[PDB]
Amino acid sequence: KSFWGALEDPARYLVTFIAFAQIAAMVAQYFSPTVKGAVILSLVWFLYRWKTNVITRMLSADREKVLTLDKVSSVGLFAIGLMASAEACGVAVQSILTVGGVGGVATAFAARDILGNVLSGLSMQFSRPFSMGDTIKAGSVEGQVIEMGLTTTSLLNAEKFPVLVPNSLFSSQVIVNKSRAQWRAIASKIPLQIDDLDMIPQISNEIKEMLRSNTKVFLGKEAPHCYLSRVEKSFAELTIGCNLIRMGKEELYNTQQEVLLEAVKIIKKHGVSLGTT
Amino acid sequence: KSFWGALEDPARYLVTFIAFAQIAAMVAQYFSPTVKGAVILSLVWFLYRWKTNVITRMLSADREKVLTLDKVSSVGLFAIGLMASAEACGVAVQSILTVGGVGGVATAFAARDILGNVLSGLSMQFSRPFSMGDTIKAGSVEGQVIEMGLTTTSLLNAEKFPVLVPNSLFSSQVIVNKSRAQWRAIASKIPLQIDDLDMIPQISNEIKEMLRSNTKVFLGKEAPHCYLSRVEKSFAELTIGCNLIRMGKEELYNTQQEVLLEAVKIIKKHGVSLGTT
Amino acid sequence: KSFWGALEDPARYLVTFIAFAQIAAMVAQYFSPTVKGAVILSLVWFLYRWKTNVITRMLSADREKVLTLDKVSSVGLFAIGLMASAEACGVAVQSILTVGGVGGVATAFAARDILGNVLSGLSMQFSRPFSMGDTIKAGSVEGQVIEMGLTTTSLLNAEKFPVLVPNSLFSSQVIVNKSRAQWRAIASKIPLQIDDLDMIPQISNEIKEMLRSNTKVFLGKEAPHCYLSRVEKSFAELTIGCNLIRMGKEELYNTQQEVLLEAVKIIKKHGVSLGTT
Amino acid sequence: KSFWGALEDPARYLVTFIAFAQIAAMVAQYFSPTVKGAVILSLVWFLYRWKTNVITRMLSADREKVLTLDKVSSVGLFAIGLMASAEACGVAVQSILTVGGVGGVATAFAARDILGNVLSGLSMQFSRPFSMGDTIKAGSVEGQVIEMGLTTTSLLNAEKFPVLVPNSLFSSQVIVNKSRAQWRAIASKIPLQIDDLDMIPQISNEIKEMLRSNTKVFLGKEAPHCYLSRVEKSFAELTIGCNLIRMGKEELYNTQQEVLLEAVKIIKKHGVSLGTT
Amino acid sequence: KSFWGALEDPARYLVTFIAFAQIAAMVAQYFSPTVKGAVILSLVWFLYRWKTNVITRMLSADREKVLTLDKVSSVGLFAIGLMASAEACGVAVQSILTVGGVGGVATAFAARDILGNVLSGLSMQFSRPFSMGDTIKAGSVEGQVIEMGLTTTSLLNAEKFPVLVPNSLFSSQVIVNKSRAQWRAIASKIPLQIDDLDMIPQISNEIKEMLRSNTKVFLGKEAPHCYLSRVEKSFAELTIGCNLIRMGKEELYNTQQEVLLEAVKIIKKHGVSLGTT
Amino acid sequence: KSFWGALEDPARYLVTFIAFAQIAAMVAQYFSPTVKGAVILSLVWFLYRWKTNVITRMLSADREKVLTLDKVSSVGLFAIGLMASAEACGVAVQSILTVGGVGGVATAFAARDILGNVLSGLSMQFSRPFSMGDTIKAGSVEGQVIEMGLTTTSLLNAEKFPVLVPNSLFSSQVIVNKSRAQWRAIASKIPLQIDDLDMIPQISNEIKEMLRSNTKVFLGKEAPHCYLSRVEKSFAELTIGCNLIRMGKEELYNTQQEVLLEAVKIIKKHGVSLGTT
Amino acid sequence: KSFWGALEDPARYLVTFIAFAQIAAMVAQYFSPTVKGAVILSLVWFLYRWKTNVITRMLSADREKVLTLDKVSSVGLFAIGLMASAEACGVAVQSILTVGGVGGVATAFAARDILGNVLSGLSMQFSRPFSMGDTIKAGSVEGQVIEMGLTTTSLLNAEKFPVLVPNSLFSSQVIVNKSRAQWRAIASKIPLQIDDLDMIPQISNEIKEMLRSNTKVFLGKEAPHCYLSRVEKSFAELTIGCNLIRMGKEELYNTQQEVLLEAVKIIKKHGVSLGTT
């Protein structure tokens, strides 16, 4: 019915048997082998009893999980029970133990991925690299964290599909956390159709001025830049860039578009025109 | 005929032999080695009997599977039977045990893929990453789940061919579940042939308005966007995007086409024309 | 001459020697070491006899295979015979056993590919992923199965060359079976030179109608689609697709060509013309 | 309450039990097995006591970390306690020890990544390859170091997102330290539309002169170069380059732009014009 | 001088020593250790004698191979001789045996490639994937087999250079045998400049007729095909293909050219012209 | 204070204890276990003393390195001290030894990279592949050697940044030494716009003559070449090349430019003009 | 001074000590442990003496190599000496042996590359794949062999830089030997601007005739070919090829240029002109 009975039946059987053997030998002397064999067989029987009542108990309340557990647990204890009494009796100890050992690391290397996922899940619960809702990018996958488990994490990628990442990928690869950034950084390239480069400096400086007198820019770490990155026949390329304050994602788009339009306005104000890549 | 006879013949032979040896020694004292050898040889014979009857029993009802099982099982017990009585007799114990051990992990590393498939099949029956009929994408393969087994899953890919994926690929790679998405997300790029960028803001805003007053859009998480992503000589590129409600797959196509046509309509309404990439 | 003599010579020699030793000790007491050494050396001699007669017997009936087997078997039993009597005599047991053990897993890791091929061949005879004549695609190779063995499969690829695939590639990679498909799926893209997109809907719908009133289409799972996938200056791209009934391979080509011609006919009927990618 | 009680309860119980057993045997002789079993069980109980009070003590002051530690520590000592008394009692020693050993290296190979991160963190604290604030580039990631830990380093990449690099990537890959450079090096390519190559030498030499009479160049290691790298129909390509003094990052941009403009000025002074790639 | 003397000197020394020790102990009792030490040292000396005589014998007839063999064999027996008498004497048995064991698998993993080549050479002599003169393609290499060895195969590639392929590449990769094909297969694509697609069917059918009334085609498995694979503005693409009978390599070229010219003739007969990709 | 005291305190304690035990047993006989336990515990205490004195001594003179060493050394000896007295006392020997062994190779495989770096550093100090100042190229990295250590080498790459290469990359990859070359080799391709190929031979020969009558060419190994590599409509491509004497890096550029200009001069002298790729 | 003294001091000390102990026990009986400890410590001292004398002897004649050897040898014998007397004394045998064993395979896997290089160097001295001066191509590297060692080979690549290839790359990759070819093979493609393909056969045949009546062609294996590989609007592509006799490298260039010019001559003789790819 419970653990109490599952113990008190084998315990009483074992005490009965050893008390029998004691007065079977006192009034040919293999008390130790028989007693050890009885102890081994009795608790093999006891955990069989305990296993059955446990997986009968939660079947008395996620169902195929329970018999998957039942069958896996039955195989496991069949294995150990066979090993243990083969060792208690003394018949073919090293042979059966060698078979069991090679089966064990067969299973132990075949299960390196499940174990990797579990151990990496624990390591992640220690050093939290992200939390629920953060937009992360792990190697090839990218999205919003929607579920954190022990063997897998669940993301929502750019097409708004739920992705399932095994947790052993967060220990061998870098993780980008797009939700902990304190300032953003934009950079673009504008092509110019220009032959009188004598006004590339002026334009450049003016654009930088525009980027410094613009709200939503961050002048704390790096200054806005706009330099000539390559030149060609009636062609030039300006590389613009700056840092922006911590903003949302529609405001980032609006700021990018606004900076681009103001830069093109400054460019066309000096009589220059855009080029063609 | 059954397990009963397959046990009662070797058991009676063994009891006969040990009872013979007892009065062969009472009225030179190697009772233990001979008794252990008899026990080992008798149950080697007993499982041979049990194996033969079991694979004769289901041959008396998927046939080449049965003798594949028969031959594999015969090799396995030949191996263990040889190890066990070489150990019971005492002749060349460590030599034969070392040979058997190196053969065992030869086989145990050669079989890492079959074991990986089986263990990953079990791990998947615990943490269900998909179910029958879901459209998944695992690494390089993509399709509808049509069969779930213990060592392989079966998909139906985009050309409507049945693919057979070994289950050890669902533990080391990410799984995209295209059937559990609750809202979709579309994004496109429209090129414009425009020289007066002074009307890029207006157009943009109007398009966003259109995307918000459109049924089948989802205004719960992110707002529709339409920003200028790059500019060029009489050329510009608008990046449009939005989220859509949970819809089928022909309605997704219809909505994409409709959004694209309405956007081009708004663009041409402002006197702008499409560009050429 | 046979197994009978190959056993009855060493067996009689061994019985003679042990009977000699018994009355050599009865009328200095190392009966066990000498008897075990005699047993080990006698059956080493017996399997040497058995090996020679077996590979002389099938040489008395695929010939270089036989002496390859002869030499490999001679090396193997030289190894085990050396290990076993070094252990029976008692001279340098652990040294020679360690040498033999490191040689054994040297050989056991060097032979991981042959063992992988054999074990995967067996695993495939259990879970049949294809049969003789099927057109499969395994990773990088594609063709018709023309031979199925235990360590290799033989295909006939697209240039009609016989390919030889090691069977360990069918356990780590996905297998596409192009001969078990129950319906096909075609998809194409048509470019249009169009400036009045006001007739992209009509055209689209008409094409879909054509794809539904066409025999050899399969309306069981997905409906035919034809949507606008991208637009450009006097340019548009229609993505067409449908499912087809289970048909041959020349009928698939004919149906593709027919669908394409009918679609272009519908397109040109509305005054539109094809574009240029 | 503390370590003192957690030791003095099991120590007094053990001393009581051994003193009982001594006069239980003096006035059947298995003093050693029972005493060793008592010692093993007593300190198993003692560290259980010590573990509970330690993880109750820092729960009496970063909380889910504490019970993660509690559960992991409970599993670990359950394992060792089971192994140790199975060995003290003598029941199924080698079987349980083999099970524990295969579980141990299952866990020891599954945890190769966490251990790699920790050991590489230590190795890095010995041979410091960078310090806080340096701009490094490790394999595929690049940014400013913002945090140095034992299992992970934290960078700030080019988009100003915090990246989390596992420390086992700094032992197998090269590390570029962009903050310890003592002089910079710029190089560019200018295309020329020229048919009279008789003035390619002159131009070249003049440009080099310009690069040597420019402040912010470093004439310590290599001389400025400007050579003809390939020629074509009315086309040529000059490859320019030089070293610059240790400067900031906006001054590097300004110097690049200035050198490029001066070079194009020299080129157009000789009646040559820029070409088109 | 020979094996006879190389045995009869150590054998007589050993018999002399054991006969001395017997009457040294009969008229302090460590007969077994000294006798085992003498046996070990004597045959260590005997194989040293045998090794020297053998590699002096074939030096008395490919010379640097002989002393490479001499030095390697001297190192090997120095190793085993040291292990064996350290074990015979009894001084530091487990220490020296552990050193020797870690050296052994250091060497046994360092030599995985040579062993792989040898074992794969044997596996190939069993399942012959090609023979001398066949034109094979193994992974990245392609050519005519000009030599088959035990650790390497020799090919003659397309530039007519001798390539040396390690035999461990024929067990992990697919092998294409271009000399066992029984029929060939050609396929080409012809672009058409056509606006009246109403004659794409006719042309197609006519071409197929041509491919069936052509000798050197194989109508046993698949029928000749010619279908429209994609269409464009005044552009179309016909995909032609057929099977050819088993022919040489200049006849294959001639047949390809002939089929192509006849197809273009049929195309231009219907007033169509070739297009431009 | 020093090693002398750190030894003479535990040595005197141990001698005192063994002298006590001797007359505690002479006037119950477990002299060996207690004496071995005392010896083990005493030198565990002695190296603890020695370790503390050593890492206190160099803290009395690169500081965080010292306590990193202190903590690592404390963990290591805690481990060995626990193993050694668990083995001396006799309580749970095999259990604790198995735990320690699986921890040991966990650490021994986790530290394969640090050990690889150290061993490869030693191997490099034996077979010197480069020296300080040489310009090497190892796999993906290239630059001037500026520091050679035991676990890492330091380079200065093309952008003049200090790179840090782990020394285990110089044992698995090829190393190009650009500072030990004794002659250089240049090669270029010139396109020609030519329709009368009847003067391709002449031009070619003339160019080769020019390359042989040029100082700074090396006529020791290979002769200068200039051949027609491919032809096209009013287009041809000459492939030129030669060897140059051992020269600097600005002289190499000057020689390349000079050879190119002289070749174009010869080409235009024959009425030919350059083509357009 | 030499090996004689380095042996005769420890040998005389050991004989003195054992002779002392014999009459210390004859007139408490631990002769075996003390004698074995003395033997172990004495030869530990003897090889220390021998090591110092040897690396002092070649320091009395490539110097940093000598102390690198000295320190490595001192560490190694410190290790073995510690293991051996810990085993001779009997204090913490299995603990120290386990530590030494895990250190040993840590070192034995960390040194897999050096051992791979050495073993592959030996394997190459057996099966010589090239010799000094041959032009080989191993995987990604190509050049003339200028030095052959035991752990590395030295090449001279196409830029005439000395490359250093680890010898473990010649056992896992294919080796192309460009110096053992007995005939060469050239192949080119000529584009034609042709609309009347009725003269593609004639031209083709004529070209083949030219290739057969040309000296320096090899008509032993394959015949010269020239076939139409693809056609297009006023465009065609002829694929030409043949085998050439064994010639140098400037004669190969001359023959290529000559064949190309003669082919273009034949082409233009038939009124055809070259096309434009």
Tab-separated table of C-alpha atoms in Angstrom, chain A residues 42-246:
chain	number	residue	atom	x	y	z
A	42	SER	CA	15.384	-8.831	-0.357
A	43	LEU	CA	16.035	-5.162	-1.115
A	44	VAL	CA	16.005	-5.840	-4.859
A	45	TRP	CA	12.493	-7.070	-4.069
A	46	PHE	CA	11.894	-4.050	-1.829
A	47	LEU	CA	12.715	-1.385	-4.417
A	48	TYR	CA	10.708	-3.329	-6.993
A	49	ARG	CA	7.845	-2.977	-4.507
A	50	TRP	CA	8.629	0.704	-3.932
A	51	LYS	CA	8.924	1.443	-7.666
A	52	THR	CA	5.591	-0.205	-8.434
A	53	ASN	CA	3.689	1.677	-5.752
A	54	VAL	CA	5.251	5.028	-6.690
A	55	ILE	CA	4.356	4.723	-10.382
A	56	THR	CA	1.004	3.314	-9.394
A	57	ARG	CA	0.451	6.260	-7.069
A	58	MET	CA	0.866	9.010	-9.692
A	59	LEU	CA	-1.145	6.919	-12.201
A	60	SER	CA	-3.841	7.372	-9.535
A	61	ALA	CA	-4.106	11.142	-9.991
A	62	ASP	CA	0.994	13.114	-18.209
A	63	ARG	CA	0.267	9.398	-18.548
A	64	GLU	CA	2.583	8.079	-21.259
A	65	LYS	CA	5.354	9.787	-19.303
A	66	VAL	CA	4.501	7.520	-16.365
A	67	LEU	CA	4.886	4.171	-18.128
A	68	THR	CA	7.934	5.427	-20.031
A	69	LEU	CA	9.284	6.013	-16.520
A	70	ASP	CA	7.965	2.609	-15.441
A	71	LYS	CA	9.649	0.679	-18.254
A	72	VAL	CA	12.937	2.597	-18.003
A	73	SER	CA	13.006	2.011	-14.247
A	74	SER	CA	12.208	-1.673	-14.699
A	75	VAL	CA	15.099	-2.109	-17.146
A	76	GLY	CA	17.483	-0.274	-14.836
A	77	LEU	CA	16.754	-2.335	-11.736
A	78	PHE	CA	16.677	-5.572	-13.730
A	79	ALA	CA	20.226	-4.625	-14.719
A	80	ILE	CA	21.459	-3.780	-11.214
A	81	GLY	CA	19.593	-6.655	-9.592
A	82	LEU	CA	21.219	-9.072	-12.021
A	83	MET	CA	24.657	-7.582	-11.378
A	84	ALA	CA	24.247	-7.570	-7.599
A	85	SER	CA	23.180	-11.169	-6.991
A	86	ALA	CA	25.517	-12.551	-9.645
A	87	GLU	CA	28.058	-10.894	-7.374
A	88	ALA	CA	26.391	-12.136	-4.186
A	89	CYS	CA	26.105	-15.743	-5.370
A	90	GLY	CA	29.592	-15.726	-6.892
A	91	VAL	CA	28.828	-17.196	-10.329
A	92	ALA	CA	30.546	-15.396	-13.212
A	93	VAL	CA	31.199	-12.176	-11.333
A	94	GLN	CA	33.760	-10.501	-13.565
A	95	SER	CA	32.110	-11.598	-16.815
A	96	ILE	CA	28.698	-10.153	-15.984
A	97	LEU	CA	30.286	-7.084	-14.402
A	98	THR	CA	32.291	-6.432	-17.573
A	99	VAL	CA	29.164	-6.807	-19.704
A	100	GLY	CA	27.348	-4.385	-17.427
A	101	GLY	CA	30.223	-1.931	-17.499
A	102	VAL	CA	30.452	-1.812	-21.273
A	103	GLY	CA	26.679	-1.432	-21.458
A	104	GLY	CA	26.903	1.389	-18.948
A	105	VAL	CA	29.294	3.622	-20.842
A	106	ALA	CA	27.602	2.710	-24.130
A	107	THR	CA	24.570	4.305	-22.491
A	108	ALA	CA	26.708	6.993	-20.859
A	109	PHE	CA	28.190	8.219	-24.109
A	110	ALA	CA	24.945	7.799	-26.036
A	111	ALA	CA	23.346	10.144	-23.485
A	112	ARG	CA	25.918	12.930	-23.647
A	113	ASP	CA	23.423	15.332	-25.217
A	114	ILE	CA	20.640	14.949	-22.649
A	115	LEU	CA	23.192	15.279	-19.862
A	116	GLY	CA	24.749	18.282	-21.576
A	117	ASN	CA	21.355	19.946	-21.774
A	118	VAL	CA	20.618	19.309	-18.101
A	119	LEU	CA	24.007	20.435	-16.798
A	120	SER	CA	23.948	23.537	-18.973
A	121	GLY	CA	20.452	24.312	-17.725
A	122	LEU	CA	21.767	24.250	-14.171
A	123	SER	CA	24.832	26.324	-15.062
A	124	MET	CA	22.486	28.870	-16.615
A	125	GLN	CA	20.320	29.080	-13.507
A	126	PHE	CA	23.507	30.042	-11.683
A	127	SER	CA	24.947	32.651	-14.078
A	128	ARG	CA	21.776	34.110	-15.566
A	129	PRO	CA	22.617	35.262	-19.115
A	130	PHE	CA	19.038	36.354	-19.837
A	131	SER	CA	15.568	36.440	-18.326
A	132	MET	CA	12.005	35.930	-19.486
A	133	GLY	CA	11.135	38.393	-22.246
A	134	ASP	CA	14.663	39.381	-23.247
A	135	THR	CA	15.498	39.468	-26.950
A	136	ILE	CA	18.575	37.272	-27.281
A	137	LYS	CA	20.608	35.957	-30.195
A	138	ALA	CA	22.349	32.620	-29.664
A	139	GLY	CA	24.505	31.585	-32.589
A	140	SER	CA	22.121	31.118	-35.493
A	141	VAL	CA	18.818	31.665	-33.654
A	142	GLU	CA	17.296	34.964	-32.574
A	143	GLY	CA	14.182	35.962	-30.682
A	144	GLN	CA	12.277	36.760	-27.512
A	145	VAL	CA	12.586	34.338	-24.611
A	146	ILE	CA	9.149	32.870	-23.912
A	147	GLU	CA	10.030	29.884	-21.699
A	148	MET	CA	13.064	28.736	-19.719
A	149	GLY	CA	13.357	25.075	-18.813
A	150	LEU	CA	16.023	22.663	-17.618
A	151	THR	CA	16.878	20.997	-20.931
A	152	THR	CA	15.509	23.497	-23.482
A	153	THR	CA	14.788	27.197	-23.861
A	154	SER	CA	11.941	28.487	-26.019
A	155	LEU	CA	12.287	31.565	-28.216
A	156	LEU	CA	10.013	33.475	-30.582
A	157	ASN	CA	11.998	34.265	-33.713
A	158	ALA	CA	11.610	37.005	-36.311
A	159	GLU	CA	8.779	35.254	-38.162
A	160	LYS	CA	7.005	34.828	-34.798
A	161	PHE	CA	7.392	30.978	-34.691
A	162	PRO	CA	8.284	29.225	-31.401
A	163	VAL	CA	11.839	27.862	-31.567
A	164	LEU	CA	13.148	25.226	-29.155
A	165	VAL	CA	16.861	25.595	-28.375
A	166	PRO	CA	18.682	22.813	-26.500
A	167	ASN	CA	20.385	24.299	-23.465
A	168	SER	CA	23.783	22.902	-24.445
A	169	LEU	CA	24.036	25.651	-27.066
A	170	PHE	CA	24.256	28.425	-24.470
A	171	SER	CA	27.524	27.086	-23.034
A	172	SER	CA	29.593	26.737	-26.209
A	173	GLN	CA	28.438	29.861	-28.083
A	174	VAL	CA	28.207	33.584	-27.455
A	175	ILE	CA	24.893	35.120	-26.401
A	176	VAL	CA	23.901	38.606	-27.528
A	177	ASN	CA	21.381	40.283	-25.245
A	178	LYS	CA	19.525	42.918	-27.235
A	179	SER	CA	17.433	43.942	-24.223
A	180	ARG	CA	20.237	45.118	-21.918
A	181	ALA	CA	21.748	47.718	-24.236
A	182	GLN	CA	21.918	51.198	-22.727
A	183	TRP	CA	22.542	53.087	-25.975
A	184	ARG	CA	22.197	52.193	-29.641
A	185	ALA	CA	24.492	52.850	-32.579
A	186	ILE	CA	23.510	53.541	-36.178
A	187	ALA	CA	25.737	53.650	-39.240
A	188	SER	CA	24.984	54.177	-42.919
A	189	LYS	CA	26.708	54.904	-46.219
A	190	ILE	CA	25.647	57.569	-48.711
A	191	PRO	CA	26.976	57.595	-52.299
A	192	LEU	CA	27.660	60.954	-53.917
A	193	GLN	CA	28.022	61.908	-57.578
A	194	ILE	CA	30.706	64.558	-57.163
A	195	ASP	CA	33.696	65.708	-59.213
A	196	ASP	CA	34.760	68.766	-57.189
A	197	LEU	CA	35.850	67.031	-53.993
A	198	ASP	CA	36.925	70.447	-52.663
A	199	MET	CA	33.610	70.487	-50.756
A	200	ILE	CA	33.791	67.018	-49.194
A	201	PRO	CA	35.299	68.466	-45.971
A	202	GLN	CA	32.644	71.152	-45.550
A	203	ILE	CA	29.735	68.757	-46.128
A	204	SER	CA	31.297	66.253	-43.751
A	205	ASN	CA	31.710	68.763	-40.929
A	206	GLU	CA	28.193	70.104	-41.415
A	207	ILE	CA	26.710	66.622	-41.174
A	208	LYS	CA	28.601	65.952	-37.960
A	209	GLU	CA	27.275	69.234	-36.572
A	210	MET	CA	23.765	68.057	-37.441
A	211	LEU	CA	24.361	64.790	-35.602
A	212	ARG	CA	25.500	66.630	-32.483
A	213	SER	CA	22.613	69.123	-32.375
A	214	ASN	CA	20.088	66.303	-32.760
A	215	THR	CA	18.304	65.083	-29.687
A	216	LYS	CA	18.310	61.300	-29.272
A	217	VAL	CA	22.069	61.151	-29.801
A	218	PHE	CA	24.482	60.041	-27.101
A	219	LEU	CA	27.651	62.127	-26.789
A	220	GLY	CA	29.024	60.174	-23.836
A	221	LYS	CA	31.390	57.657	-25.422
A	222	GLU	CA	32.046	58.391	-29.107
A	223	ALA	CA	31.548	61.371	-31.296
A	224	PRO	CA	29.481	61.292	-34.489
A	225	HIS	CA	31.591	60.608	-37.556
A	226	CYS	CA	31.213	61.224	-41.277
A	227	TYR	CA	34.285	60.493	-43.388
A	228	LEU	CA	35.102	59.722	-47.007
A	229	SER	CA	35.565	55.968	-47.252
A	230	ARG	CA	36.346	55.584	-50.960
A	231	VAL	CA	36.380	57.685	-54.114
A	232	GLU	CA	35.735	56.966	-57.787
A	233	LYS	CA	35.011	58.661	-61.124
A	234	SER	CA	32.329	61.240	-60.281
A	235	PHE	CA	31.636	59.078	-57.243
A	236	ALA	CA	32.335	59.156	-53.514
A	237	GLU	CA	31.080	57.322	-50.444
A	238	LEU	CA	30.430	58.972	-47.082
A	239	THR	CA	30.266	56.716	-44.034
A	240	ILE	CA	28.007	58.246	-41.386
A	241	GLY	CA	27.399	56.995	-37.876
A	242	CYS	CA	26.515	57.964	-34.337
A	243	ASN	CA	25.247	56.661	-31.018
A	244	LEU	CA	21.627	57.070	-29.964
A	245	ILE	CA	20.023	57.208	-26.524
A	246	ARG	CA	18.194	54.176	-25.163
